[PDB]
Design a protein around this ligand. Structure first.
Ligand code: HEM
Length: 182
């Protein structure tokens, strides 16, 4: 089942409120035609350049960052163009991104919340409609709606009383989350 880690700072927050606020603050990096700048708003892959076990992106407007983990592939200009696909296992949110391919991986100096065992599986043929693409491109764009919807489904699968409107502490009591030190 989905497994959530959260700093105790967020114990009383709903998942939805946390994600709404986190993504709004992260803010759209404007990864769109005419506006992509390598090393500014592309993010990066480990080991890369366009594939790997992690994709990570910081907002330059500020040191808020996320890391997507799994088995990821980015098509770049190849058909279907500008598609992130593959297997998405985890999303970690926080700030102060560190590492990269030259370090052997990415990490957050302050990891606030992670969602693991997401089980998202998107074939290349689905293109930009795939769930992996929607989740991650959403986050790049300051929009956690797609992530929220996938988490909500995973929580309901455990029990229909559980949802993104549960608090992190409620989810811990329900067996799907654990707290970490603030
Ligand atoms: C190493 C990381 C990446 C690089 C270097 C990169 C590079 C690019 C480039 C060069 C463009 C075209 C810019 C232009 O037309 O002027 C682009 C567009 C785009 N990229 Fe990325 N990208 C990266 C990661 C991602 C990821 C992870 C996603 C999805 C989750 C993504 C989604 C898109 C989308 C949706 C567009 C717009 C495509 C269009 O409107 O036709 N990119 N990217």
């Amino acid at each position: 089942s989905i497994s959530i880690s959260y700093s105790t700072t967020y114990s009383g927050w709903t998942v939805a409120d946390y994600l709404a606020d986190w993504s709004a603050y992260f803010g759209d990096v404007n990864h769109r035609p005419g506006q992509v700048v390598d090393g500014s708003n592309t993010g990066g892959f480990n080991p890369g350049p366009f594939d790997g076990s992690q994709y990570a992106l910081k907002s330059t407007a500020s040191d808020a960052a996320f890391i997507a983990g799994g088995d990821l592939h980015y098509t770049l200009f190849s058909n279907p163009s500008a598609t992130l696909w593959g297997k998405l296992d985890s999303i970690a949110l926080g700030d102060t991104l560190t590492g990269g391919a030259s370090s052997g991986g990415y990490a957050l100096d302050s990891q606030e919340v992670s969602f693991s065992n997401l089980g998202l599986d998107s074939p290349i043929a689905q293109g930009r409609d795939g769930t992996v693409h929607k989740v991650v491109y959403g986050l790049m764009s300051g929009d956690s709606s797609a992530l929220q919807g996938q988490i909500d489904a995973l929580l309901k699968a455990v029990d229909p009383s559980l949802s993104i409107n549960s608090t992190f502490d409620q989810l811990a009591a329900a067996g799907v989350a654990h707290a970490t030190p603030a």
